[PDB]
Every structure is written in C-alpha cells, then in structure tokens.
Amino acid sequence: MAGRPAVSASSRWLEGIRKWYYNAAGFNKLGLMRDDTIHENDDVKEAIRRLPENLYDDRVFRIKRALDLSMRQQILPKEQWTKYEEDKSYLEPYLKEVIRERKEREEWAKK
Amino acid sequence: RIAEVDARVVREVCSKYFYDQCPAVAGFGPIEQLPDYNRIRSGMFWLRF
C-alpha cells in the first residue's frame, strides 16, 4: 500500500514506485538519509536542537561528507549508498512533537 | 657559535627555513576559526599574500 492513490500505479504495482523514486531522487548516492535533506525552517531547526548527541553528530558528518562529494561532483561507491529499506526516519518523532507543540500554541492564541 | 650570530645571519637563516616554505599544521579542539591552509600558506611571504 504505497506509491499512488490508485490500487496499481502506472509502472506496475504500488510499492515499487516509491522504491523507484528513492533511487531516482539520488540523495542516497551522496550518503544522506531522507531527513538529512529536509528544509530547515524555524520548526525543523528547533527539532534538530532536540536531537541526541550521538544522532546529531552522525547527521553532521553525513552532511559534511556529502558536500565534499558535491564539491567534487562525485558519488559514493555502489556499496556505500543508503539502502531504501535501511533508511529510517531519525527526525520524524522529533518533528511530530514540534508539530503538536506549535499547533497547540497557535490554536491557543485564537480563542 | 653563539657569539658569531648577528642580525644578518638571523635574517638569512630564518628566510631559508621559514620564508615561502610550506608549513605543517596540526589542530585540536574548536578550530572552526582556524584559517584555511591557503590563507596559512600565503602568510609565509610578504607583500604578495
């Protein structure tokens, strides 16, 4: 149950479309996870500040080496890419709480 | 040997090992401000940096 609202996508089945898009996006070739490429607004920036030191420091190096790869216009070897199944959201739990906090704060103002 | 050192010797000896030579830099700690090597290398000569 993935891909498109239809039960079957254009290029057969539904789950493989997201897998196909992950390789098409190409941020795994740089050694970055999905949440390492997110837009840093006033919400995401706070949710980064709550990251544990072991996870925040890991994110820094993944970004640091990706810019080195982008500077040289290169990519990581085929064995060092971020697998689609092994990519996990290390920032979604923190984003959701800031979503919850901001929604309560915003709605409390209008009362 | 110490009594035979003067300004001319120091100017010649220092310029032979310090001037325009590539230095080796080692850092540790919060070295974000530490200048880039090209900025460090260009500090090895005057009026041309």
């Binding site: 996006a25 999905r34 | 260009s42």
Partner: protein, 379 residues
C-alpha cells in the same frame, strides 16, 4: 601589533564580506553569474560613460552622432559594440541568475529574492530606454509599440502615455528624456545591488545540495576570487567573441536606417531579451489582457516563493520537478523563438499554447509536483 586586527575602523570591515566571508565549498559554476552580473554593471557603466561623451540626444543629430562615434572616434567603434553586446551578455547572465534561484530554491531568501526582482525590473527598463537612444527605425518603432501599450490602462492610459512621451508621440522630447533617464538608472542599480547583497550576507549563501552548509564553509578570498576571475574571463571571451567576430549577429539590421515616423519597418520587434515577453502579450487579442499578461509574467517571480510545496529546498533530489523545470526553460525558449516571428496561423496556435503553458507550469504543475513527491517520500 595584531596583523589580524587590520585597519578595521575604516571601510575594510565592509570588505571582510569579500575576503573572510564564509561560503559553501560545493558552490557550482552557476553561482559565478552573481559576480558576472556585477562585472556587467561596471562594464556597461564604463563603456556607457565614454559613449555619452560623444552622443547627443537631439533627434536631428542622434543617429548621426552614433555614426560619428564609430567612423571618427579613435577606437570608438569597439566601445559602441561592447555596449551593444554587453547588454546581450547582461541578460544572458541575468536569466541564469534567475534560473539558478528557481532550481536551487534560493527564493527562500525572501528579502534578497524580492530585491532581485526589483533589480530585474530596473535593468529591463534601462535596456529598453537605451535601445531608443540610437534612433534608428528600430529604436523609434520598437519604443512606439511598447510604450503605446500603456494606453490600454483604463481612465489614466492616455494621461500617462503622453506624460511619458512628452508630447503626442515619440519624438525629440522623448529622446532627450530617455538619455537622461538612461544615465541615472544604472547608478541606482549599483545602490540596489549593494542592498541586494546586504540581505544575503546575513543569511549566507545556498548550495546545490540545498542543505545548510554551515558545517563546510570555506574562506572566500583564496577559493572563489580565483574562481570568479576564471568566470570573468569566460564572460570577456564570450562578449569579445561577439564584438570582434559578429558585432551585428544579435542586433536587427533594420536599426541602421534613420528613424522615419512616416515609414514602418517590415517587421516590428524588440531586442532578443524581450521577445519572450512580446509573445505573451501577442497571445491575447485583448489589449488590456495583453499588457497585464506582459507585466504578470515578469512579476510572477515575486509569487514564486509563496508557491513552494516540497519539503526539500533545491531541485537536486526532486526528479519530478526537474522534468518540469527544463520544460519551463524549453517553453521560455519557444516563447523567445516565436517572439521574433510574424503573427500568422502557425505561430498564433503555438504562441497561445506556449504562453498558456508558461503560467500553467509555475502556477499549477510545479506546486503539484512538490506535493506528489512529498507524498512519495513518507512526509
């Protein structure tokens, strides 16, 4: 005495933005057009000032003074053509500066981006006003059709059209005003460009990745000054290639006959950097609709930052939006191609379709592209 603590209580502290400014390491060549744009301003002003020392705005001796510049002034022929082709290089550089922001999401710098549109509008005004200066049957008639578009404005059209014209039509009164206006506006652009940087250095620069580059900033002086110098030479090579090997390749041949209000040119058209906007106006038979679409297409840039939908900033990891971005660039080239062609039955159909697609892509398809991928990435 601290070498680092330099002559700080002076103007060098401002110049620290040129030497010690942190910049992303992964800056590609598409960023070089920022420094190229500044060189284009300086080059245009330098050649412009020396052109203004022999150009006379009176109608009876406007065209003849341009001929005197090339024929009589020592080395005056090259200066006229680096000015004529510098504007071509200006708008070549100007359109890639806008395109990079579209692709790399630099419009998230709301203050800088908005000042960028103001900078864009000022140059197109300066370029249009300077084209009328030679007064050569393309200057008179190119300004005639475009300026008369303001008559479509309701209840104030003819009032300001004459106030622009200084009379009932384009004449010597308009010509003198344009030369004075063409002299002042470029110096306004320098002031705005300084403000343009002031709204950017506070928030840093952008990278092709689109992620924050605070972890991998490098000094500007030893890495980008030599990168901009190489980029400058590629601009000088490209500009000088036109000037010395095909000076009239871009300019229309009809501009070499003196302006004659009683005679019309075989085909009327602006310079190549406005042909993309001419097609949009010509798409709609209505007069009021055409002028609005002409202004809206240029002013749609300010509406772009409010249309962002994707959770990623740059288009580097957005393959669906990449297919649309080059469709917009290709369509913008279709508008440029069809702008210089007469309004006949093949270009009437293609002209409307290209124009309706230009607005449809940015307003509908691009925001829908970001939403589709956002769903496709579990967020």
């Amino acid at each position: 005495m601290t070498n680092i603590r330099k002559s700080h209580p002076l103007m060098k502290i401002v110049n620290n933005a040129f030497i010690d400014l942190p910049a992303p390491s992964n800056i590609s060549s598409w960023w070089n057009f920022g420094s190229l744009l500044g060189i284009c301003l300086i080059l245009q002003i330098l050649t412009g000032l020396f052109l203004a020392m022999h150009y006379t705005s009176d109608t009876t001796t406007a065209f003849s003074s341009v001929t005197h510049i090339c024929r009589d002034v020592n080395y005056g022929w090259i200066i006229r053509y680096m000015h004529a082709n510098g504007a071509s290089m200006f708008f070549i550089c100007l359109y890639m500066h806008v395109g990079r922001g579209l692709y790399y999401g630099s419009y998230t710098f709301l203050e800088t981006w908005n000042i960028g549109v103001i900078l864009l509008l000022t140059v197109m005004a300066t370029a249009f006003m300077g084209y009328v200066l030679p007064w050569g049957q393309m200057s008179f008639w190119g300004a005639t059709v475009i300026t008369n578009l303001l008559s479509a404005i309701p209840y104030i059209g003819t009032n300001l059209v004459e106030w622009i014209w200084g009379g009932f039509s384009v004449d010597k009164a308009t010509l003198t005003r344009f030369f004075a206006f063409h002299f002042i506006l470029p110096f306004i652009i320098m002031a705005i460009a300084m403000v343009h940087l002031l709204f950017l250095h506070e928030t840093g620069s952008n990278n092709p990745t689109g992620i924050s580059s605070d972890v991998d900033k490098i000094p500007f002086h030893p890495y980008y000054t030599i990168k901009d110098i190489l980029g400058a030479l590629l601009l000088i090579l490209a500009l000088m290639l036109l000037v010395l090997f095909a000076p009239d390749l871009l300019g229309d041949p009809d501009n070499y006959t003196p302006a004659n209000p009683l005679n019309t040119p075989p085909h009327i058209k602006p310079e190549w950097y406005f042909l993309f906007a001419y097609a949009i106006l010509r798409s709609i038979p209505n007069k009021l609709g055409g002028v609005l679409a002409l202004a809206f297409s240029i002013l749609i840039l300010a509406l772009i930052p409010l249309l962002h939908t994707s959770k990623q900033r740059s288009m580097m990891f957005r393959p669906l939006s990449q297919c649309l971005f080059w469709a917009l660039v290709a369509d913008l080239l279709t508008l440029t191609w069809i702008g210089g062609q007469p309004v006949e039955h093949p270009y009437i159909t293609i002209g409307q379709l290209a124009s309706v697609l230009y607005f449809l892509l940015i307003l509908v398809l691009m925001p829908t592209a970001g939403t589709i991928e956002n769903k496709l990435l579990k967020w």
